[PDB]
Structure formats: structure tokens, C-alpha cells
């Protein structure tokens, strides 16, 4: 049991080794409610967040917005619209490679 | 000016250093930098390791 446990974790970790590490995303995110028809059980579940990302050239910036689940973000500043990703305080996040099932 | 958890924020911090760990820049009394900055990057030892 212990060997299965350790080997699965080891293989899991190896598979993420070559994938992009998402450190450019630890920026403040300004989040508002989603402009759509949301059922009662989904109210407040999603947030529409914009942020300023780096790009291919380090002296250029881009405006990006995306939808996030509320569980992946945490408020900050003055408990208003300024939110950040949850992982930013604990550790950097790695994106899983899209080609790997 | 120290970096912080978020890339687009900075914090002002002060600390005490031993003189032997810093080197003046351009003979300017106000400006100093850490000794290792021109040479290899420094690494902090883990506080959990004796």
C-alpha cells in the first residue's frame, strides 16, 4: 500500500515538472459579478476578474480578464473588489500540461 | 523596498545589518548594497535546520 502510495505521488509530480509555472499571475485581481442569468444555487459562485499580466516581452503588459470560481480566490485590500488568488500566500502554482490526461 | 506576495506591490522595510555584510556604492554615504550582489546570488539558510 505504501509503495503504491509513494509511486503514484512520485509519478504525479514528475508529470508536472516540464509545465509552465504560473508565477506571473500573483497580481491583484479586480473582481465583479458575472453578467449572465445565474440560478439561485450559483449566485456568487463565479466572479469576473481582470488583471495586468506580463507577456512575451518583459517591457510589455496585457489586460486580461477571466472567470474564476469563488473558491479559488480570496478578498484583500479593504474587503471590496480587490481579490487575489488563494495560492499566492502559501506557494507558487503549476499549470497542468493540456496534453496530459 | 522589498518585493512581497503580489508582484505589483512593494513594501518598505528596515533592518539592522553588520557593516561587514554591506559595501558602499560610488563613495555615497547614503547608498549601500549587499556584498554578494555583484558576485553570486545569496541563499537564506532554513530556520528549521540546525
Amino acid at each position, epitope marked *: 500500500v505504501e509503495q503504491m502510495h509513494e509511486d503514484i505521488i512520485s509519478l504525479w509530480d514528475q508529470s508536472l515538472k516540464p509545465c509552465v509555472k504560473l508565477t*506571473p499571475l500573483c*497580481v491583484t485581481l479586480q473582481c465583479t459579478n458575472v453578467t449572465n442569468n445565474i440560478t439561485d444555487d450559483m449566485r456568487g459562485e463565479l466572479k469576473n476578474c481582470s488583471f495586468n499580466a*506580463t507577456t512575451e516581452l*518583459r*517591457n510589455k503588459r496585457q489586460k486580461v480578464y477571466s472567470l474564476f470560481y469563488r473558491l479559488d480566490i480570496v478578498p484583500m485590500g479593504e474587503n471590496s473588489t480587490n481579490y487575489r488568488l488563494i495560492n499566492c500566500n502559501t506557494s507558487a502554482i503549476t499549470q497542468a500540461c493540456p496534453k496530459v490526461s | 523596498n522589498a518585493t512581497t506576495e503580489l508582484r505589483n506591490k512593494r513594501q518598505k522595510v528596515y533592518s539592522l545589518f553588520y557593516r561587514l555584510d554591506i559595501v558602499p556604492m560610488g563613495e555615497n554615504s547614503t547608498n549601500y548594497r549587499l556584498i554578494n550582489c555583484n558576485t553570486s546570488a545569496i541563499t537564506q539558510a532554513c530556520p528549521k535546520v540546525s
Partner: antibody
Framework: EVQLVESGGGLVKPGGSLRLACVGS????????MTWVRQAPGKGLEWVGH??????????DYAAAVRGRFTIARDDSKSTLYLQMNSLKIEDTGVYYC?????????????????????????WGKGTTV | EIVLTQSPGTLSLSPGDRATLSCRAT???????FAWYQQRPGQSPRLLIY???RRAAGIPDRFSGSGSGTDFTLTIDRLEPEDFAVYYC????????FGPGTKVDI
């Protein structure tokens, strides 16, 4: 050279209509907050109305004096702001100015922190007289 | 529907003196929504100060100001001949209107 150029002003007898336009250049038009201000001879600066950046939703607002008579519109492919003034009155005579703001800045990121130092370029056109 | 007023009607100062220009609101305006412009007669107005205290790009350091709520001030450290213009205050939070303007004269 960031600039705005107004055109179309002239005097139309009361009850008629006139269309003004303003062409922006050297600025992403669609990202700009465009505002019409007018000044009749001997008068101060009167707000006419405005339209928020296209990219921020295109919301509009108007001075009470022109609500229901004036219409604000934009066509970003032409970098042009328009004002359609219907049911003109004598009190609508004056200089119509096209004014907006452009924030440009020098972005520079490292691998541990990023910064964006911005500067605001107040751009007004010369104004067109109605 | 907040209205701005200004004082004095005309400010009479010699060149080289210090201008003080007042603006008052009927209701509070957030600092990030208050601004001043300089209108040399015959010219389009030019933004001096925005966000209550922030200087516009291209504007000389002699221009400065401060304020909050319903009480704001624009000042000029030393008047130049070109500064004897009409200054207007403008709000842009809920109300996008201008005050009447103050002429600076000698």
C-alpha cells in the same frame, strides 16, 4: 501627437438639427472616455454629455438641458465621436469641445516584481462653433 | 446633481505673487473625482490638476492643490504673465459639471 479634431459646427435656426463629429488620432479611441463640453460666448464651461470607453461598456450620460434632444454615438473603426443635436434652440449656440484623457506609461517587469509607471495626456480639440 | 461654485470672481495679483483659487460643492465629491483646468481666453481649457492633487503631464511644478468633501483649493506658487487666465473647477463622480470659473488678473 495625441489629438482631437472637431468639425461640423455652424448655426442652424431653432427647430432644425446639426451633426457634430470629432476624430481622434494617435490614441486607442475605443479605450477613451469621450466627453462633450460647450461654451457659448460670455459663458463658462457647460457639460453636454459623455460616453464611457467602448471596452468598459459604452455607458452614456447627459446634461439635463440637452436630454431628449441630443444623442451621443461612437464609431471606433473611424476613431470618431458624434453628437446629433435635434430640436436646436438659440441657447445651443457656442463652441463645442471634444475632450478625453490618454494614460500612457512605461511597463518594466523583472522575474520577482512588475511595475507600470503611468502619465496622463489631457487632450482637447480646438472646438467647433455651432 | 451636485453643483460647484467658485471664489473670488476675479483674483487680482501682481506677476510673481501666489494665487489661491477656491471651489466649493453643494455635496461631497470624492478626491479622485475633483479637477481644475486653466482657460486662457480664446483657447480650449487645459487640465492642470486631477484627482484633487495630481499634476497633469506637461504642467509646470508651480501648479498644485488639495482638498476633500465639499472644500477644494488650487494654488499657483508664482504667477507668470501667462497664468492670468480663467480657472475652472470640475467634478466627475455623479455630476460632471463645472463651477463658474475665477479670473486671475493684475
Amino acid at each position: 501627437e495625441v489629438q482631437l479634431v472637431e468639425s461640423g459646427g455652424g448655426l442652424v435656426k431653432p427647430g432644425g438639427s446639426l451633426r457634430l463629429a470629432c476624430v481622434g488620432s494617435e490614441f486607442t479611441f475605443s479605450e477613451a472616455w469621450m466627453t462633450w463640453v460647450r461654451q457659448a460666448p460670455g459663458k463658462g464651461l457647460e457639460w453636454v454629455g459623455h460616453m464611457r470607453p467602448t471596452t468598459e461598456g459604452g455607458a452614456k450620460d447627459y446634461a439635463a438641458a440637452v436630454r431628449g434632444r441630443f444623442t451621443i454615438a461612437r464609431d471606433d473603426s473611424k476613431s470618431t465621436l458624434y453628437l446629433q443635436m435635434n430640436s436646436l434652440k438659440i441657447e445651443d449656440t457656442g463652441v463645442y469641445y471634444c475632450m478625453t484623457g490618454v494614460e500612457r506609461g512605461d511597463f518594466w517587469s523583472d522575474d520577482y516584481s512588475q511595475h507600470y509607471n503611468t502619465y496622463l495626456i489631457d487632450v482637447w480639440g480646438k472646438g467647433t462653433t455651432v | 446633481e451636485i453643483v460647484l461654485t467658485q471664489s473670488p470672481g476675479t483674483l487680482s495679483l501682481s506677476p510673481g505673487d501666489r494665487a489661491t483659487l477656491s471651489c466649493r460643492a453643494t455635496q461631497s465629491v470624492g478626491g479622485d473625482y475633483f479637477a481644475w483646468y486653466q482657460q486662457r481666453p480664446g483657447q480650449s481649457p487645459r487640465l492642470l490638476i486631477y484627482g484633487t492633487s495630481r499634476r497633469a503631464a506637461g504642467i509646470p511644478d508651480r501648479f498644485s492643490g488639495s482638498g476633500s468633501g465639499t472644500d477644494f483649493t488650487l494654488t499657483i506658487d508664482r504667477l507668470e504673465p501667462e497664468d492670468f487666465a480663467v480657472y475652472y473647477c470640475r467634478q466627475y463622480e455623479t455630476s460632471f459639471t463645472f463651477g463658474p470659473g475665477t479670473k486671475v488678473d493684475i
